[model samples]
Target: RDVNVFKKVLENIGNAVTQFNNDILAYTGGDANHLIHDGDAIIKATENGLQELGPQPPLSLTEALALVGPVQGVNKLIMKTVDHLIEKKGPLVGGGYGPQVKASLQKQAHAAVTLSELVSSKVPSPLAPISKQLSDQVAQALQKGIEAFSI
Candidate 1:
């Protein structure tokens, strides 16, 4: 169930990122909140599974990437999602919910943290043991995306 929950989390992040883009393109405002609650649910699921399974063995990049073969588009989708957010939402808000909109969007990265390094980086324990590539992609997306949200 370890790999199962990890990939499922990536899957949901990919799916949620897709929906977030759709909301932006369609001008559907409330979906901003949709993106957040989606993150919320995914976060809890990750936590519960972690609580049951406990810490995982340390994993390397090759072993980690193979876990997501069934879901090929997720990584690139996350990249595109962040790219879209950057293009449309920039780093600053003149005034409005755009500020919190950006903040809520920031929550998408937590799952990556959960999968990667859940604690103080003082040790080598990632809750999901995802090495770095998979975790890094999500994080790179978020941190790169944050450059825009830095507004």
Candidate 2:
């Protein structure tokens, strides 16, 4: 039924957010604000269509499902960026960098956390719980590694 579909969609949202943050960590080289820059790009690209959807607009279930395609594109873009980084720089999460890179890592985490907050805020009511949980998970994941590129 629709309930099961919605549950799966919610779960996907959470998983996407988690993977997005992890990928941010994997990229960024632990030396720049690349996460913030890239995150902003994705948000900017989608803001128009989503704004048209509005906060509580009436829509057919089919119309609602239409949103998933764009979301999947966004997810793919993020993962592609991570793949590009890996191709260029090898593994970054624990590739044996120095403490000097810690500040940059923290900045990247902060950017991802902020992006999660934005996502959690703007999503619909039914999705709000999962969205907020994504933000919380990002915060928790950042806690242990708040001081370095590795936890």
Candidate 3:
């Protein structure tokens, strides 16, 4: 019944995260001329993740949810990423850090979307593995956010 719905959410989140992570890796590894390519991936990811996992009121609009965790955290993660980016904008289109920085900056927004979803769910605790997976990539993306944050 509802379990099946949760399954779909899980599968979609996994796929989206995997794709976003890979794109981030490629951008950081210096695979392309345009640094913002990764940003596009994150944007698409956030949108899709939200579309699949967004929250909806139960049958009664005024009533509380029967059981949350259908997928609200994905949106949280996206917003966090976006806020993180707004706080740190660097080189943009110059130097080696340019593309990588842009990728991470944009990634932060994407990640935030998921994080937001997590916070709104009844999952109790954070999914360590998933958080770590997302965090590691974000950590890499922030080499420049850090530099900019410090300076």
Candidate 4:
């Protein structure tokens, strides 16, 4: 049933967000050089979170992103780390890090678009205002994060 599908989405997003936090830690607390490896983790996570979630129709898609938490915030976390690395390391190389980060950034944009779709579609009144808010908080955060990843 649909509930089973939703369950998988929930598991995937949580795994993605937690992996994101770990990636941040790997870049910060662990070897800064490991971002080369961890970027792979992030790229795979986009698959787990977004790609693996799969084909959320614009109708159901409106609600698909709604269940997951910490996800919207992780979009915020992605940027500050990118800024820190650019300032501290002076660009990255090896381990296909650049392409991996780029790939993740594209997936991030996909999520933002899907989430933005949520607010424009039909929603009952009370939920509508709250629904409108995340586009402000999250989609913009995604835009801001995507802006930061030019490396």
Provide the overall lDDT of each model, using Cα atoms, as 2-decimal numbers.
0.54, 0.46, 0.44, 0.49
- Candidate 3 achieves a global lDDT of 0.44
- Candidate 4: list runs displaced more than 4 Å: 1-8, 28-100, 115-125
lDDT string for model 4 (41-145, tens) is 544554554553455433244353454344345445554544554433324334334554555556766755664454235334545555577556655554554
Residue-pair clash count for candidate 3: 28
Among all windows of 10 consecutive residues in model 2, the one with the lowest summed lDDT is 48-57
Identify the candidate with maximal lDDT: 1
- Backbone clash pairs for candidate 1 read 91-148, 91-151
Judge candidate 3 at residue 117 and give its lDDT. Answer: 52
Runs off by more than 4 Å, candidate 1: 1-7, 28-66, 70-72, 90-95, 118-130
lDDT tens string, model 3, 1-151? Answer: 4344444544565455545444433332333434355555545654564565455321221111322333335434433543444343333333345445545554654565464454245233334344344445444444445445342
Tens digit of per-residue lDDT, candidate 2, span 1-151: 4334333443444454454456555664554345444444434433432343234334344544454455545445444544444343333544454332344435545655555555444556676564565456545544444433334
What would the TM-scores of all predictions be? 0.59, 0.38, 0.39, 0.50
In candidate 3 the C-alpha lDDT for residue 134 amounts to 44
Could you tell me which 10 consecutive residues in candidate 3 have the lowest summed lDDT? Answer: 58-67
Please give the lDDT score at residue 81 for candidate 3.
Answer: 48
Candidate 1 lDDT, 47-91, residue by residue in tens = 554453345454344444455464346777767766766665632
Angstrom error of the Cα, residue 36, model 3: value is 4.0
Q: Say which prediction, candidate 1 or candidate 3, comes out ahead on TM-score.
A: 1
RMSD of 3: 8.9
